[PDB]
Amino acid sequence: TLPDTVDWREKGCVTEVKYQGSCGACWAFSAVGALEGQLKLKTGKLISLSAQNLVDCSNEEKYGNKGCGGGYMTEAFQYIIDNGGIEADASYPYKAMDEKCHYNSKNRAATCSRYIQLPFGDEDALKEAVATKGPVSVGIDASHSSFFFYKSGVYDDPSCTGNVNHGVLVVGYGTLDGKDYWLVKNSWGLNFGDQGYIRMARNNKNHCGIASYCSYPEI
Ligand SMILES: *C(=N)CNC(=O)[C@@H]1C[C@@H](S(=O)(=O)c2ccccc2)C[C@H]1C(=O)N1CCOCC1
């Protein structure tokens, strides 16, 4: 049986909530968050990895990422594979701007060997990954004003669609007052949601397309 409740924060696998600013780098934060979880599970050490490294160095047609113009978590993972590593946020800090790539292999802090995508729209498969693998990068439809009015409980706006536009991190799941949810880490600072987190409806027919583009890296 899978556990009825999972929270990777309680296992020390989730870093502090970040603030992406005006730069559309949610995809890079999602990607590093997933890798951070893996790095902790492999090494026992929890370290913020460099979203800026992704923004600066994967901004090319090769990857189809566009720095602050947006990108894809799986292509971030591919960049890390191709590049042989990624720096920590400490040596490559977040500027919220597209800049020249200055990755340096001597500050490598994590690697990626491969990544895994889950089947489109499969909430059961996302539950399994989250319970057995770690935090999972997902795309959601976060285009509705209600997403940002949310403060507590479980977000289940009927205006939500399956057309995803933002990368976030699922760090757990459970059931709150009878409503199944996904525990989502965003990258809009602590004043977003509930200290940077939002519970989104789970098992409601792929609500906000949360199960539509799920991935996680393997160290
Ligand atoms: C975040 N702050 C800005 N949004 C993005 O970067 C999104 C995230 C991904 S997705 O997860 O929404 C997605 C969409 C479609 C198929 C698979 C995943 C897409 C990305 C985005 O807006 N773009 C559009 C411009 O080109 C780069 C990707």
Q: Relative to the CA of 27, which ligand 1 atom is closest?
A: 6
Give the list of residues 6+ apart from residue 117 with CB closer than 8 angstroms, or none: 74, 213, 214, 215
Rounded Cα gap, residues 209 and 213, in angstroms: 8
Distance in angstroms (rounded) separating the CA atoms of residues 155 and 175: 12
Which residues on neighbouring strands pair with residue 40, listed in sequence order? none
Is the CB of residue 174 below 6 angstroms from any atom belonging to ligand 1? no
Residues in CB range of 211: below 8 A, 6 or more apart: 118, 120, 121, 122, 123, 125, 126, 138
The number of folded domains in the chain is 1
Q: How far is CA 121 from CA 7, 59, 67, 213, in A?
A: 22, 28, 27, 8
Secondary structure of 83-150 as H, E, C letters: HCCEEECCCCCCCCCCCCCCCCHHHEEECCCEEEECCCCCHHHHHHHHHHCCCEEEEECCCCHHHHHC
The verdict on the CB of residue 71 being under 6 Å from ligand 1 is: yes
Angstrom distance (rounded) from CA 28 to CA 67: 9
Strand partners, 7: 172
The letter for the amino acid at 109 is: A
CATH number, domain with residue 70: 3.90.70.10
Q: What is the residue range of 6's domain? A: 1-219
User: Residue 77 has what DSSP assignment?
Assistant: H
Considering the candidates 65, 83, 186, 206, report the single residue annotated as catalytic: 186
Return all residues near 101 (Cβ < 8 A) that are at least 6 apart.
53, 56, 57
Active site residue 26: yes
